[PDB]
Structure formats: structure tokens, C-alpha cells
Ligand binder design. Structure first.
Ligand SMILES: [Ca+2]
Ligand SMILES: [Ca+2]
Ligand SMILES: [Ca+2]
Ligand SMILES: [Zn+2]
Ligand SMILES: [Zn+2]
Length: 164
């Protein structure tokens, strides 16, 4: 079931992301480093196109917030809900939100922003959840070297099932 319940996906090859705010847990460089790589893992598995912006119209709006921040979701700070984003949304759709309470970093320590970023955008695109024990869509999170980190068959199968 590597895909949202239906067909919320925009079904377009034009996407973008805009980081509303930056967390003190990551570095100005690490933020763009982990992100650029995140989108480079999905834009390579689909004939789509992703772009970065700080003052434009992006699909995946990244906003690091803590607990309840006006999203009817109310995070859980340290541990728990690492992050949550949308998909079939306009202007503010696919808005990815990361729990600031968490320790986002570029190493195996804190919650690697890179990995979390990749899967974060997936939801903003309109992807669902996979049952693969190694699928990014999986609700489970785990650190992994970017050199070894790759979208599982389920992820690539789903992402392409709506874009391919
Ligand atoms: Ca959390
Ligand atoms: Ca948006
Ligand atoms: Ca923090
Ligand atoms: Zn939120
Ligand atoms: Zn997920």
C-alpha cells in the first residue's frame, strides 16, 4: 500500500520546497546539505523536478515546530512524533513539520535531517505508507549512511505508481 488512500498526488513533475524556519539543532549548511540530498533521492526515482526557495511558491513547506502549533496534531516533543506533513494541499499543502523538541543533526546521533527530509517530502508529494521492513514510507525511522540509504522497492514502486 505504498501510496495514499486514493489519488491525492498532484500527478505533476513540478514540485518545490521552502524552509519556513531553521532549527538550532542543525547547521545552516547541514540544513541545505541534508535537504538537497533528500530531494535528490526522490527526484532520481521519478521524472519529477524539485526546487528550493525561501520566498516563493513551494509544495513541501518545512517548518520546525514543537508540540501543538496550530495543526490539530500537537506534537509530543522529544521522542515520538518525529514529524508530520501533508500532500494533496495547495499553497500550504504537503507542508512538512518537524518536531523541534527533537535533536536534528547531520550525524548518526540526533535525528538525521537528511533521512527525515527525504521521507518528509514523500508525504508532501502524496505518497502513502509501505509495509516493507526497509521502505522509507514505513512508519519506522532509522539512521543509515547516505551511501547505503536508498528507496526500497516499495517506495520506488509507489512513487512511480503515481508519477511513473
Ligand atoms: Ca517527537
Ligand atoms: Ca505548501
Ligand atoms: Ca531540539
Ligand atoms: Zn504540524
Ligand atoms: Zn510516514
Amino acid at each position: 500500500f505504498r501510496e495514499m488512500p486514493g489519488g491525492p498526488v498532484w500527478r505533476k513533475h513540478y514540485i518545490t520546497y521552502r524552509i519556513n524556519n531553521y532549527t538550532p539543532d542543525m547547521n545552516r549548511e547541514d540544513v541545505d546539505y541534508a535537504i538537497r540530498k533528500a530531494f535528490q533521492v526522490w527526484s532520481n526515482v521519478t521524472p519529477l523536478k524539485f526546487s528550493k526557495i525561501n520566498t516563493g511558491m513551494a509544495d513541501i513547506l518545512v517548518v520546525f515546530a514543537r508540540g501543538a502549533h496550530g495543526d490539530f496534531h500537537a506534537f509530543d516533543g522529544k521522542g515520538g512524533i518525529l514529524a508530520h506533513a501533508f500532500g494533496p494541499g495547495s499553497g500550504i499543502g504537503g507542508d512538512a513539520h518537524f518536531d523541534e523538541d527533537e535533536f536534528w543533526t547531520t550525524h548518526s546521533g540526533g535525528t538525521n535531517l537528511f533521512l527525515t527530509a527525504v521521507h518528509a517530502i514523500g508525504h508532501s508529494l502524496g505518497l502513502g505508507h509501505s509495509s516493507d521492513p526497509k521502505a522509507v514510507m514505513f512508519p519506522t525511522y532509522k539512521y543509515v549512511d547516505i551511501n547505503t540509504f536508498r528507496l526500497s522497492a516499495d517506495d520506488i514502486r509507489g512513487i512511480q505508481s503515481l508519477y511513473g
